[PDB]
Amino acid sequence: MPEQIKEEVASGDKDKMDKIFEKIEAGLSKLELGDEFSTPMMVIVDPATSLKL
Amino acid sequence: ASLLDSNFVPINFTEFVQAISNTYKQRRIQFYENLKR
């Protein structure tokens, strides 16, 4: 979907969960919910991401 | 007009397609009713 918050984790930090979570925090901060912030959230991940998590 | 209704009898293919769409919508509603998180 265009005009959304895109974050990229470099290949050197492909196994660095700290760097991945830093990128996730940056994206969450860049997120804009406005007056509809009081809503449930959904996260979709791949098996490798779940294993790292 | 839903296929889940045994009393329903379609007349033509257009009514059959409408019944199929209604059945799919009802199945989605039932899935959301039965879903637990």
Added chain:
Amino acid sequence: ALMKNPQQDSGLLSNSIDFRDQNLIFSNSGGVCTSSKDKIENYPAKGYPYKRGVKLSFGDGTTELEVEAGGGDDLYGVCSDIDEFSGMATVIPITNNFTGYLTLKKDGQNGVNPGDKLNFNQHGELEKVKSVNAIALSKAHKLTEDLFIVLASVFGNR
């Protein structure tokens, strides 16, 4: 001339077959394009200030004020109609914009063209140009040998 309606009667019946150029009569009181949100006052009439700029005129004090034909630095409004029986003049204040046919001075009336700036003289007649914003929207139309009318829009003070 001195009456909004023709003082003399007529010996003919109007054809009423055409629709073009039928609003040039002197009896066409009011504005050509009027808004429902226009403030309208009425005043006692001194003379015949019909279709002219009107200014306040007072007396010794025994009687109320009235309006008389005039202009310049004393201009108060524009007269659009007159009830003769009650001697009353309808006044549109200069704070309210007006658009309609007004009396034009019979001096250089041919030079008056659309877009020409106009101003009120001491007798309430429009004249080609000070302190009042008035713009002619048409050319002078002759009703009598000394009576000329021009479509003008007045939109306040300069």
Added chain:
Amino acid sequence: LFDENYYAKAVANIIGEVKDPIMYKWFSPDQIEDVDLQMGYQKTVKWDAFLN
């Protein structure tokens, strides 16, 4: 129609055996709303108000 269309009859009979799509778990019940169209484009208008 069922007396003539065996394929339609079989589709109506076996339509219940198809499992529900898993994409429904990714949306709330109120987020999904069907529209009547097959191929083409549709324009959606959103209205908002503000204080002056």
Added chain:
Amino acid sequence: YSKSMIENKVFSSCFKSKNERVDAYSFACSSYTDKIEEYLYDPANSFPYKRGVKLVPKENSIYVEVGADTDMYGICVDVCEFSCTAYVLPITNNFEGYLVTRNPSIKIGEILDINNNGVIIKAGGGPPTAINIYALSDSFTINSINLIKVAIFGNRGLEKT
């Protein structure tokens, strides 16, 4: 340009500061008994929306064209592009609303003047102002066009400097 200005792939993202739109309702505070007039405008010379306009009597109709404060008839508050018709609030009426300006840095309370393009500018440019215009808010840029909230109440007695 235009007011409405287009299909979008996605929708655009509190109640505060949502009025900063080019096609917003011009009157910040409206009132019945406000006189609104209709005129024609040139569809290829200048777009009169949210600009000070003057009456130009042409050989076929009376048009409104963007004009300066010296010969200003009123303020164009809305335009119907289908009929190319401009809606004008005469200068004899008060106005309090958003107008087009060319200076992106104007503070609140400053004295303002309308230039030859029907555009709000600072009154210190040198031309003698003839209208009472005051800035009710800081100028804001919509990305680009600059707008500002102004209060216009009648003509000024003696032209200022």
Added chain:
Amino acid sequence: ELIKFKPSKYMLPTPNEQVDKDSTDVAHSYIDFVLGGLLATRKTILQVNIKQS
């Protein structure tokens, strides 16, 4: 209020009326489906990609 899915009511598979028949015992059938209809507001989706190279 932020993300809305408006699928066609024929998005899920639907049989076609046309059936291919011949002198043999093998027949053919067609299934139709419709794709498209996701709508979202700007800056409401966070997409994180972990580059592998």
Added chain:
Amino acid sequence: VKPYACEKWEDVLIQTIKAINNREDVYIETSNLLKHKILIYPLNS
């Protein structure tokens, strides 16, 4: 939600408020209408 300096500042605040409100319920709300402000008050009529 930052770690307290495996406990959170929110948990510590909830425990502190429970210490004073006779260990009743403590509700936490986030509002975009506030800016660098914290409001604490009982729900007693």
Added chain:
Amino acid sequence: INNNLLPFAQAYKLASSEIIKLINHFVLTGTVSIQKDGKNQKRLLPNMYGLLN
């Protein structure tokens, strides 16, 4: 008579007659005007023509 005021019915009838005359003129000529000279024409929309223009 002195103020040129009419009952609503008569005023409406006269106004309707004048408007129908204008409509007939517009249908025949393709232009709208209230002058015998034909000037000061009202500007009309494109794809709006009469039998003469």
Added chain:
Amino acid sequence: INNNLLPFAQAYKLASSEIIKLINHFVLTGTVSIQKDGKNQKRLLPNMYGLLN
């Protein structure tokens, strides 16, 4: 769409939503303003306080 004109029902619904948002802001804060900076506040009467003031 061009003139931004709506039916009375929808217009009233949107205006009521905006006014309810303003009322909620006043109740939470105690000030009335329509700017993000919180300036150009409407002066209020005494004995009219919110939770924050």
Added chain:
Amino acid sequence: MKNPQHDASLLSNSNEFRDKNVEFFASGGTRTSKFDKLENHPFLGYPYKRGVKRVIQSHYEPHVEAGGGEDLYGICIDIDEFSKTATIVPITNNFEGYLVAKDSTVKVKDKLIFNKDGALEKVTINATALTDAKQISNEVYLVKVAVFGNK
């Protein structure tokens, strides 16, 4: 104040129908039209029956206060003390009524200007006096004028 609320012990005889309108409590105007523009504004001080100017600056919305001259914005014809608001007729709208005069020198046929205190004083011109200045109480003088704008 516009309406000084004081309790009395005896009723005041009020039967004459003449010379009963020239008073400080009579708000509005002698003649008013339905199509007159009225604006409610927050005020400071007491600009009642006076020329009001708009003063613009925790930042607050602009208010109105007694004044005149090049800063003249309107005339205050009514006031609400509880809401601390004032009803104002803008300078673009003509007004006819009794307003506060600086002194008793104002007479009929006198051109009057709003001073820095919002009071009408003899000579741009703003009003034309219709009656003589009348002392309501102490140094308060009310004069009937017909406001037309600024020259």
